[PDB]
Structures are given as structure tokens and as C-alpha cells.
Coordinates of C-alpha atoms in Angstrom, one line a residue:
Chain A
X1 CA 110.6 113.2 115.5
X2 CA 109.6 109.3 114.9
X3 CA 107.7 109.9 112.3
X4 CA 108.9 109.1 108.5
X5 CA 108.6 112.3 106.2
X6 CA 109.8 113.3 102.7
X7 CA 113.6 114.0 101.5
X8 CA 114.7 112.2 104.3
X9 CA 117.4 109.3 103.8
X10 CA 116.3 105.7 104.4
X11 CA 117.5 102.9 104.3
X12 CA 115.0 99.2 103.3
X13 CA 115.9 96.5 105.9
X14 CA 114.8 93.1 106.1
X15 CA 115.0 89.6 108.2
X16 CA 115.6 86.2 106.6
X17 CA 115.4 83.0 108.3
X18 CA 118.9 81.1 107.3
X19 CA 120.1 78.0 109.0
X20 CA 117.9 78.8 112.0
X21 CA 119.8 82.3 112.8
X22 CA 118.1 85.7 111.5
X23 CA 120.2 88.0 108.6
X24 CA 119.6 91.4 108.3
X25 CA 119.4 92.8 104.6
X26 CA 119.4 95.8 103.5
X27 CA 118.3 97.0 99.4
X28 CA 121.2 98.0 97.4
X29 CA 121.9 98.7 94.0
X30 CA 125.2 100.4 91.9
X31 CA 124.1 103.4 89.1
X32 CA 126.1 102.6 86.4
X33 CA 126.8 99.1 84.8
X34 CA 124.3 96.9 87.2
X35 CA 121.4 98.8 87.4
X36 CA 119.6 95.7 89.1
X37 CA 119.0 95.6 93.1
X38 CA 120.7 93.5 95.0
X39 CA 120.6 93.1 99.1
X40 CA 123.8 93.8 101.4
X41 CA 124.0 91.6 104.3
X42 CA 124.2 94.1 107.6
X43 CA 124.1 91.5 110.7
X44 CA 127.6 90.7 110.5
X45 CA 129.1 95.0 110.6
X46 CA 131.5 93.5 113.3
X47 CA 133.3 91.9 111.7
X48 CA 133.2 92.9 108.0
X49 CA 132.1 96.4 107.1
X50 CA 129.0 96.8 105.3
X51 CA 128.3 99.2 101.8
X52 CA 126.1 101.1 103.2
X53 CA 127.1 104.0 100.4
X54 CA 124.4 102.1 97.9
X55 CA 121.6 101.3 100.3
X56 CA 120.3 105.2 100.9
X57 CA 117.1 106.2 99.4
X58 CA 115.6 109.4 99.8
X59 CA 111.7 109.9 99.5
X60 CA 110.6 112.1 97.1
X61 CA 107.3 112.5 97.3
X62 CA 104.4 111.0 99.8
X63 CA 101.0 111.6 97.8
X64 CA 97.7 109.6 98.0
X65 CA 96.6 106.9 95.5
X66 CA 93.7 109.5 94.1
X67 CA 96.3 112.6 94.3
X68 CA 98.9 110.2 92.4
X69 CA 95.8 109.0 89.3
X70 CA 95.3 112.8 88.6
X71 CA 99.2 113.4 88.4
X72 CA 99.5 110.6 86.0
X73 CA 96.1 111.7 84.1
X74 CA 97.0 115.7 83.9
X75 CA 100.9 115.3 84.2
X76 CA 107.9 120.4 101.1
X77 CA 107.8 117.6 104.5
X78 CA 104.4 115.9 104.9
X79 CA 104.4 112.5 106.8
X80 CA 104.5 109.1 104.9
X81 CA 100.4 107.5 105.3
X82 CA 99.4 104.2 105.4
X83 CA 97.8 103.6 101.7
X84 CA 100.2 106.5 100.2
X85 CA 102.4 106.5 97.0
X86 CA 105.9 107.0 97.9
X87 CA 108.2 108.0 95.0
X88 CA 112.3 106.5 95.7
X89 CA 115.0 108.2 94.6
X90 CA 118.3 106.3 94.8
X91 CA 120.6 109.0 96.7
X92 CA 124.7 108.1 95.3
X93 CA 123.6 107.5 91.5
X94 CA 120.0 109.8 91.3
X95 CA 117.7 107.0 89.7
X96 CA 115.1 106.2 91.1
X97 CA 113.3 102.3 92.3
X98 CA 111.6 100.9 89.6
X99 CA 109.7 97.7 89.4
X100 CA 111.0 96.2 86.0
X101 CA 109.0 94.6 83.9
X102 CA 112.1 92.0 82.8
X103 CA 112.5 88.7 84.9
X104 CA 115.1 86.2 86.1
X105 CA 114.1 84.3 88.6
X106 CA 113.6 80.8 87.7
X107 CA 111.7 79.6 91.0
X108 CA 109.1 82.2 90.5
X109 CA 107.7 82.8 87.1
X110 CA 105.5 85.4 88.0
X111 CA 108.0 87.3 89.7
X112 CA 109.1 90.9 88.0
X113 CA 112.5 92.8 88.0
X114 CA 113.3 95.6 90.8
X115 CA 115.7 97.9 89.5
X116 CA 116.9 101.6 89.2
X117 CA 115.8 103.7 86.7
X118 CA 116.9 107.2 85.2
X119 CA 113.4 108.7 85.4
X120 CA 110.3 108.5 87.7
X121 CA 108.0 108.2 84.4
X122 CA 104.7 106.7 85.0
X123 CA 103.5 103.7 87.6
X124 CA 106.7 102.2 87.7
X125 CA 108.6 103.8 90.3
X126 CA 105.8 104.5 92.9
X127 CA 105.4 102.0 96.0
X128 CA 101.9 101.8 98.0
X129 CA 103.2 101.3 102.2
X130 CA 100.4 99.2 103.8
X131 CA 100.5 98.3 107.7
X132 CA 101.9 94.2 108.5
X133 CA 99.6 93.2 111.1
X134 CA 96.5 95.0 112.7
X135 CA 97.5 97.2 115.2
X136 CA 97.9 100.1 112.2
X137 CA 95.8 101.6 109.8
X138 CA 95.7 102.7 106.2
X139 CA 95.3 106.8 107.0
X140 CA 98.0 106.3 110.1
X141 CA 101.4 107.9 110.4
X142 CA 104.4 105.3 109.9
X143 CA 106.0 105.6 112.3
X144 CA 109.9 104.7 112.3
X145 CA 110.9 101.4 113.6
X146 CA 107.7 100.0 111.9
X147 CA 107.0 96.8 108.9
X148 CA 105.7 98.2 106.4
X149 CA 105.0 96.0 102.9
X150 CA 105.4 97.9 99.4
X151 CA 103.2 97.5 96.8
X152 CA 104.1 98.3 93.1
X153 CA 101.4 100.7 91.9
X154 CA 102.2 98.9 87.9
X155 CA 101.6 95.5 88.6
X156 CA 100.4 95.3 91.9
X157 CA 103.5 93.3 93.5
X158 CA 105.1 93.0 97.1
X159 CA 108.9 93.5 97.0
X160 CA 109.5 90.2 98.4
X161 CA 112.9 88.2 99.3
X162 CA 113.5 85.3 97.7
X163 CA 115.6 82.4 99.6
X164 CA 117.6 79.5 97.5
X165 CA 119.5 76.9 98.8
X166 CA 120.8 79.9 100.7
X167 CA 121.1 82.7 98.2
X168 CA 119.0 85.6 98.9
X169 CA 117.8 87.8 95.7
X170 CA 114.7 90.6 96.1
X171 CA 112.1 90.7 93.4
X172 CA 108.5 91.8 92.8
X173 CA 106.5 88.9 94.0
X174 CA 103.0 88.0 95.3
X175 CA 104.1 86.9 98.4
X176 CA 104.4 89.4 101.1
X177 CA 107.6 90.5 102.9
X178 CA 108.5 93.0 105.8
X179 CA 110.2 96.1 105.5
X180 CA 111.6 98.3 108.4
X181 CA 112.4 101.4 107.4
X182 CA 115.5 103.1 109.1
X183 CA 116.0 106.7 108.5
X184 CA 119.4 107.8 108.1
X185 CA 119.7 111.4 108.0
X186 CA 116.2 113.3 108.7
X187 CA 116.0 116.1 106.2
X188 CA 114.5 118.9 109.0
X189 CA 118.7 119.3 109.3
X190 CA 120.1 120.9 106.6
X191 CA 122.7 122.3 108.1
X192 CA 126.1 122.4 106.2
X193 CA 129.9 122.6 107.1
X194 CA 129.7 120.0 109.6
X195 CA 131.0 116.2 109.5
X196 CA 127.6 114.3 109.1
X197 CA 128.4 110.3 108.5
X198 CA 129.3 108.7 105.2
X199 CA 131.1 111.7 103.5
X200 CA 133.5 111.8 101.6
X201 CA 136.6 113.9 103.4
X202 CA 139.8 114.9 102.5
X203 CA 142.7 115.2 105.9
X204 CA 144.5 118.0 105.0
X205 CA 148.1 117.6 107.4
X206 CA 147.8 121.3 108.0
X207 CA 147.9 123.7 105.0
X208 CA 149.2 121.6 102.0
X209 CA 150.3 117.9 102.7
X210 CA 146.7 115.9 102.7
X211 CA 146.6 111.7 103.6
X212 CA 146.9 109.6 100.4
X213 CA 148.0 106.3 98.6
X214 CA 150.6 105.7 95.9
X215 CA 149.0 104.3 93.8
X216 CA 145.1 103.4 92.5
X217 CA 146.1 99.9 90.7
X218 CA 146.5 97.1 92.9
Chain B
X1 CA 83.2 109.2 123.8
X2 CA 85.4 112.6 122.3
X3 CA 87.9 110.5 120.4
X4 CA 85.6 108.4 118.5
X5 CA 84.1 111.4 117.4
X6 CA 87.4 112.5 116.4
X7 CA 88.5 109.2 114.9
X8 CA 84.5 109.4 112.8
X9 CA 85.7 113.0 111.8
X10 CA 88.8 111.3 110.3
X11 CA 87.6 108.6 108.5
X12 CA 84.9 111.3 106.7
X13 CA 88.1 113.9 105.9
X14 CA 89.7 111.1 104.3
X15 CA 86.3 110.4 102.6
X16 CA 86.2 114.0 101.5
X17 CA 89.3 114.4 99.9
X18 CA 88.8 111.8 97.7
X19 CA 85.6 113.1 96.2
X20 CA 87.7 116.4 95.9
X21 CA 90.1 114.2 93.7
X22 CA 87.8 112.8 91.8
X23 CA 86.4 116.5 90.9
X24 CA 89.1 118.1 90.8
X25 CA 90.4 118.0 87.3
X26 CA 86.6 118.7 86.2
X27 CA 85.1 121.4 85.6
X28 CA 82.1 121.7 86.5
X29 CA 80.0 118.9 89.1
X30 CA 76.9 117.5 88.6
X31 CA 74.0 116.6 90.2
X32 CA 74.7 113.9 91.9
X33 CA 78.3 115.2 93.7
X34 CA 76.7 118.1 94.7
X35 CA 73.8 115.9 96.3
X36 CA 76.6 114.0 98.2
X37 CA 78.9 116.9 99.3
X38 CA 76.8 118.9 100.5
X39 CA 75.6 115.1 102.2
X40 CA 78.9 115.8 103.5
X41 CA 79.0 119.2 104.0
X42 CA 76.0 118.9 106.7
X43 CA 77.3 115.6 108.6
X44 CA 81.1 117.3 109.2
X45 CA 78.8 121.1 110.2
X46 CA 76.8 118.5 112.4
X47 CA 80.4 116.7 114.0
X48 CA 82.1 120.2 114.4
Chain C
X1 CA 74.5 126.9 97.5
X2 CA 77.5 124.8 97.6
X3 CA 79.7 127.5 98.2
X4 CA 77.7 128.9 100.4
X5 CA 77.6 125.4 102.4
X6 CA 81.8 125.0 102.3
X7 CA 81.6 129.0 103.2
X8 CA 79.3 127.8 106.7
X9 CA 81.8 124.8 107.8
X10 CA 84.8 126.7 107.3
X11 CA 83.3 128.9 109.9
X12 CA 82.3 126.3 111.5
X13 CA 85.7 124.5 112.4
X14 CA 87.5 128.1 112.8
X15 CA 84.8 128.4 115.7
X16 CA 85.6 125.1 117.1
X17 CA 89.3 126.1 116.5
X18 CA 88.9 129.2 118.5
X19 CA 87.2 127.0 121.5
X20 CA 90.0 125.1 121.0
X21 CA 91.8 127.8 122.4
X22 CA 89.6 128.8 125.4
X23 CA 91.8 130.0 128.5
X24 CA 95.0 128.9 126.7
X25 CA 97.9 130.7 128.9
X26 CA 101.2 132.7 127.1
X27 CA 103.3 129.6 125.4
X28 CA 100.9 127.1 126.4
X29 CA 100.9 123.4 124.2
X30 CA 97.8 123.9 122.6
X31 CA 98.4 127.1 121.1
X32 CA 101.8 125.6 120.1
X33 CA 100.4 122.4 118.3
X34 CA 98.0 125.0 116.7
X35 CA 100.5 127.1 115.5
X36 CA 102.7 123.3 113.9
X37 CA 99.0 122.7 111.8
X38 CA 98.4 126.6 110.0
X39 CA 102.1 125.9 109.3
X40 CA 101.9 122.8 108.7
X41 CA 98.9 123.5 105.9
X42 CA 100.5 127.0 105.0
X43 CA 100.1 127.1 101.6
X44 CA 96.1 126.5 101.9
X45 CA 95.8 128.8 104.7
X46 CA 97.9 131.3 102.0
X47 CA 95.0 131.0 99.6
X48 CA 92.3 130.9 101.8
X49 CA 93.5 134.8 103.4
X50 CA 94.2 135.8 99.6
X51 CA 90.4 134.9 98.5
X52 CA 89.0 136.5 101.5
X53 CA 91.7 140.0 100.9
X54 CA 90.9 139.9 97.9
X55 CA 87.0 139.8 97.7
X56 CA 87.3 142.0 100.8
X57 CA 89.0 145.0 98.8
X58 CA 86.4 144.6 95.9
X59 CA 84.0 146.7 98.1
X60 CA 86.3 149.1 98.7
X61 CA 86.9 150.0 95.3
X62 CA 84.0 149.6 93.6
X63 CA 82.6 152.6 95.6
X64 CA 85.4 154.7 94.7
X65 CA 85.3 158.0 93.0
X66 CA 87.2 156.7 89.9
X67 CA 85.0 153.5 89.7
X68 CA 81.8 156.3 89.9
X69 CA 83.5 157.5 87.2
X70 CA 83.7 154.4 85.1
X71 CA 79.7 154.5 85.6
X72 CA 78.1 157.2 86.0
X73 CA 74.6 156.4 85.5
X74 CA 73.9 155.1 88.5
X75 CA 72.3 152.8 87.8
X76 CA 74.4 149.6 88.7
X77 CA 75.2 146.8 86.2
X78 CA 78.7 147.6 84.2
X79 CA 80.8 145.5 81.4
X80 CA 83.7 143.7 81.8
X81 CA 85.9 146.2 80.2
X82 CA 84.8 148.5 82.1
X83 CA 85.6 146.4 84.9
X84 CA 88.9 145.4 83.8
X85 CA 90.3 149.0 83.0
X86 CA 88.2 150.6 86.8
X87 CA 90.2 147.4 88.5
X88 CA 93.3 148.4 86.8
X89 CA 93.2 151.8 87.5
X90 CA 93.5 151.1 91.2
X91 CA 96.5 149.8 91.2
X92 CA 96.3 147.3 93.7
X93 CA 95.8 144.0 92.4
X94 CA 97.4 141.8 89.6
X95 CA 97.0 140.4 86.5
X96 CA 96.2 137.0 87.7
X97 CA 93.3 138.3 90.6
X98 CA 92.0 140.4 88.3
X99 CA 91.6 137.5 85.9
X100 CA 90.0 135.7 88.3
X101 CA 87.5 138.4 88.9
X102 CA 86.2 138.5 85.8
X103 CA 86.4 134.3 85.6
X104 CA 83.9 134.6 88.9
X105 CA 81.2 137.2 87.4
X106 CA 78.7 135.6 85.3
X107 CA 78.0 138.0 82.0
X108 CA 75.8 137.7 78.7
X109 CA 74.9 138.6 75.2
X110 CA 75.8 141.9 76.1
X111 CA 78.7 141.3 78.3
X112 CA 77.1 143.2 81.3
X113 CA 76.1 142.2 84.5
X114 CA 75.5 144.3 87.7
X115 CA 77.9 144.4 89.9
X116 CA 76.3 145.5 93.1
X117 CA 74.5 141.4 92.9
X118 CA 78.5 140.0 92.8
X119 CA 80.1 141.9 95.3
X120 CA 77.2 140.9 97.8
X121 CA 77.6 137.7 96.8
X122 CA 81.3 137.8 97.3
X123 CA 81.0 140.3 100.3
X124 CA 79.5 139.8 103.1
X125 CA 80.2 135.9 103.4
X126 CA 84.3 137.2 103.4
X127 CA 83.6 139.7 106.1
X128 CA 82.1 137.2 108.4
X129 CA 84.8 134.3 108.0
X130 CA 87.3 136.8 107.8
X131 CA 87.0 138.0 111.2
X132 CA 87.3 135.1 113.0
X133 CA 90.3 133.5 111.4
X134 CA 91.6 137.3 111.8
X135 CA 90.6 136.8 115.1
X136 CA 92.4 133.7 115.7
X137 CA 95.9 134.8 113.9
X138 CA 95.3 137.6 116.5
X139 CA 95.4 135.3 119.0
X140 CA 98.0 132.7 118.6
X141 CA 100.1 136.2 118.2
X142 CA 99.8 137.3 121.8
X143 CA 99.9 133.9 123.3
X144 CA 102.7 133.4 121.2
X145 CA 104.7 136.5 121.2
Chain D
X1 CA 92.8 98.8 81.9
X2 CA 96.3 98.5 80.8
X3 CA 97.4 97.9 84.7
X4 CA 95.1 94.9 84.3
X5 CA 95.7 93.6 81.0
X6 CA 99.4 93.4 82.0
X7 CA 98.7 91.6 84.2
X8 CA 96.2 89.3 82.8
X9 CA 99.2 88.5 80.7
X10 CA 102.2 88.5 82.6
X11 CA 99.1 85.1 84.4
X12 CA 99.5 83.8 81.7
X13 CA 102.0 83.5 78.1
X14 CA 100.8 82.2 74.7
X15 CA 103.2 79.8 74.6
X16 CA 101.0 77.8 77.3
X17 CA 97.6 78.9 74.6
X18 CA 99.4 77.5 72.0
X19 CA 100.4 74.6 73.2
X20 CA 96.6 73.5 74.9
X21 CA 95.0 74.4 71.4
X22 CA 98.1 71.9 69.6
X23 CA 97.0 69.0 72.4
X24 CA 95.1 66.8 70.3
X25 CA 91.9 64.7 70.7
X26 CA 90.4 61.7 71.4
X27 CA 87.8 61.0 68.9
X28 CA 85.3 58.3 68.1
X29 CA 86.5 56.0 64.7
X30 CA 85.0 53.4 62.9
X31 CA 85.7 49.6 63.6
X32 CA 86.5 46.6 61.2
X33 CA 83.9 44.9 62.2
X34 CA 81.4 47.7 61.6
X35 CA 80.9 49.2 65.2
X36 CA 81.4 53.0 66.2
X37 CA 84.1 53.1 69.2
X38 CA 83.4 56.5 71.1
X39 CA 85.6 56.8 73.8
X40 CA 84.1 58.6 77.4
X41 CA 83.5 62.3 77.0
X42 CA 84.0 62.8 80.7
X43 CA 87.1 61.4 81.1
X44 CA 88.9 63.3 78.4
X45 CA 90.3 66.4 76.6
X46 CA 87.4 67.5 75.2
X47 CA 86.5 70.6 72.2
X48 CA 85.4 72.5 74.7
Chain E
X1 CA 88.9 94.6 87.6
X2 CA 87.6 93.6 91.8
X3 CA 87.9 89.9 91.0
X4 CA 91.7 90.1 89.6
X5 CA 92.9 92.1 92.4
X6 CA 90.8 90.0 94.7
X7 CA 92.1 86.6 92.4
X8 CA 95.8 88.0 92.3
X9 CA 96.1 89.0 95.9
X10 CA 95.2 85.4 96.6
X11 CA 97.2 83.3 94.1
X12 CA 96.4 79.8 95.6
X13 CA 92.8 80.0 93.4
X14 CA 95.3 79.5 90.2
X15 CA 95.4 76.4 91.2
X16 CA 98.6 74.4 91.8
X17 CA 100.4 75.3 88.3
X18 CA 100.4 79.1 88.2
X19 CA 101.1 79.2 92.2
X20 CA 104.4 80.5 91.8
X21 CA 107.8 78.8 92.3
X22 CA 107.1 75.4 92.0
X23 CA 104.5 75.7 89.8
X24 CA 105.2 74.5 86.7
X25 CA 103.2 76.1 84.1
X26 CA 99.1 76.0 82.2
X27 CA 100.4 73.8 79.8
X28 CA 102.1 71.0 81.3
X29 CA 99.1 70.9 83.6
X30 CA 97.0 70.1 81.1
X31 CA 99.2 67.4 80.1
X32 CA 99.7 66.2 83.2
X33 CA 95.9 65.7 83.8
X34 CA 95.5 63.9 80.8
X35 CA 98.1 61.6 81.9
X36 CA 96.3 61.1 84.7
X37 CA 92.9 60.5 83.1
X38 CA 94.8 57.8 81.2
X39 CA 96.2 55.9 84.8
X40 CA 92.7 54.2 85.8
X41 CA 95.1 53.9 89.2
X42 CA 95.0 57.8 89.5
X43 CA 91.9 58.6 87.6
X44 CA 89.1 56.5 89.5
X45 CA 89.8 54.8 93.4
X46 CA 90.5 51.6 93.7
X47 CA 88.6 48.3 92.4
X48 CA 86.1 47.1 96.0

């Protein structure tokens, strides 16, 4: 289909104009050792392979704002609508995308860090989707290839790309930035036993031999 | 005109869903909520 | 009154959905889209159907001989404990359904209510609207075989 | 309320408020000739 | 809540100090305003 539903594996892509050339980046993070988010470049994929293992997120829930408030006060597949609050789960680590209260941006004093957190508790992990222009409106279904605006529920801050002397970072700021949501795997298909992209496999030669290298130590 | 009627119906449905989610966690509904609910249901009946 | 207005609005919506299926062919597009819509909201459809099914079983389970033995006087006023024991004895309701039925019944300090008014209040709208729901489901079933 | 107070705390740190409160004022003095030297209150940092 | 939401959606209402990514700060703004008040060339128009 042409609409985003829940339990769908997507990537979040943005465009930065650096040195009069547009460069595309994807939102990525690691699980262990470093919970902060970074941007993985994907424009020069022909020369350097992108690492899209850490760029995948799963759309868990797509609740309404009033429904989110009721769920937080109390405590299958549905199409994402503009004005709804979604929950993003990191596909590799199993953590959730969270607007962190800590900050490290020297340029922007009002910006916050964005990272991964183990549990989805409170408003810090929910993000509201808003249209980028007048062509869309709230209550309309989110289409594949649209430019979205993600606003933190807890801090009321846009997910924003910061450019500083060629350095590219991502933070929760008061300036907006458009994001493209490219689906990598639709959640409707649940067939197993067939080779999908991004799978980790062993290539057995016959029944006992397999493809290996002598040592991990470089 | 048919699509315009559908558009107003969709806006009214979103408003009624918001009102229900306001009243979802409460045991009773007061007189103002019942009055506004009755008005909204009358308008929805006319649109249907 | 609010429940009556909500049920009238539900009947109006089902009448509109039946008017959409007017002159629909076998394996037509509007039938496919209506089946997709009803599948997409199948939990709420099941809730509405369970509501109708409970309040349609309530009429036949309050006219049987066992319930007549539960109220030998025939005045039409029974207590909540006798109604609970009667609906447990018919072996048709589950515990959640009988708890919901006891919650929907308004008692007093004597813990007694007129079950005739209760059944007449909750059964006639069910019989009026569930027929249109059944007509819609039969139409979709026969035109999407 | 917690969200609004968190936004207001993120806007203004305590160090800025304490620094502004700690700013010294210019106040009228008595001259050696016995005159009063009042600074201009419409052009200076004020207690208000 | 409405006013705070409207103010943070348009941060240029906060002035050059609290704009972010270039804003010096509230205390720095107040000290700069004191320096402006000390200099007659900046505080007032040129004579004539």
C-alpha cells in the first residue's frame, strides 16, 4: 500500500545542503556503549556502503493525542494520521527513541539531546506527526514519501538537523526540519523461510562446510 | 457537494471522538456533556 | 435518552451503509471496501454484536419455565440474587455477561426491580437495530461469497 | 503543568536570574558641596 | 499554556538573547544593555 501502518520497519531520512550539494542522512543509533543518536550518510552509497542496520525503527503505536493523554493518566495495524502521536522502537537494540533532558549543543542552548531509552514510559518517547505544507492536513492518512515534522510530546521541540562548519548532528530544537519516512519492510507480510534483505545468514557448502575467516582479530 | 458533506462528516466525527476520549475515563456524564452530545448526534443524524 | 439517541444514530448509519450496497454486483468494489472497513474495525463490530446478542437472549431466557419458577408470583418484580441464580441456571451467559447485566439493572433499597421494564427497555432497540445489522451482513456474505 | 514548568525552566537558567539580581544599581549621593546628585532613572538599570 | 505554546512556536518573540544558536543569554543581554546605556552614541541619536 501507499500508507504507513503500525509494526512497519521504516527509516527517517533528511536532506542537508552542504557546500551547495544536497546530502541525505538517516537517523541512526547504537544500543550498547552509546545511546545518543547520529546521522548516517546515504548519498554516496555507490562508493561507501551505508550501515542501515542501526537506522531501522518500528512503528509500534499511533495513538491520538486525547487517547495518549487518557492512556498516560490511566496507565493491530492502523494507518498513521497527521496530528497523531507515534512510538518508535529501535529495531536492533529494542530501545525507544527518546527526547533526552540532557544537552550538549554549544551552538543552541535551548536544544536537547535525542537518544535511545530502554523503556517507553511517559511523554518522552512519543512524537507527534505534523504536515510540512498546506497540501496535507490533520486527520489525513500519512503517505509514503511525504515530508513530516516530528514534535516531542514532552518538550514541544522539533526533531531538527543542525549544521555547524560541515558537522551534521540531530537534536530536539525549536527550529523545524523535514523528514522523509521510507519504509524498509511492511508489517503486513509475515511470511518466513525466505531470504529478505538485511538478514544475517550462514552460507553452508553442502551440509557441514561453511564460509568463514580464520580470525576476528584484525 | 457530496464530497463536501463527507468532509464535514469527517470533521464532526473527529470532534465526537475527542469528546468521547475526554469522557472515557469518567464514571458519569454531566448535563453539559449530555447536551453537547445530543446536539452533535442530531447533526450527525441529519448528515447521514 | 442519550443511549436512545446513540442507538438511533447507529440505525441511521447502518441504513446509509445498506443504501451504499444498493444494486451491488457479486464481487463488486463497494462490497470489497465495506468488508475492508468492517474488518478494520472488527473489535468494535464484535462488541456491538455481543451487546445485541446478550439483549436478544435476555428475552427468551426471561420467558422460560425455569425463570417462571424463579418468580412464582408473576407480579414481574424480582431481586438481583434470584436473577443471578436464574441466569446462571440457564447455562447460556458467561460470568462477564451476567455481571454486565446485573450492572445495567437499577435496584433500590429492597434490592428488587421490575425485570419486565428492564427487558422491554433493552430488548426492543436491539431487535430494531440488529435486524439491519443482520441484513447488512447477509447482503455482504451473499455478494462476496 | 509539569510540561509548562519544564519548558519555562529550560528557557531561563537560575544563573541568569541570580546574575541579574546581583547587578549593582546606581543610586543618588550627596556631594561635598551639599547637593543631591540623582541619576536619570529613565536611562539606567532600575530596581523595577 | 496557550501563550507559552505560541511563544515557543515563534522564538523570535523572545528577542535576540533567547533565540538559540547565536543568542548570548539573558544576563549577557542585560549587561550589554547596561553598556549601551553607558555609551551616549548607542543610547541616543547623534547630536544635530
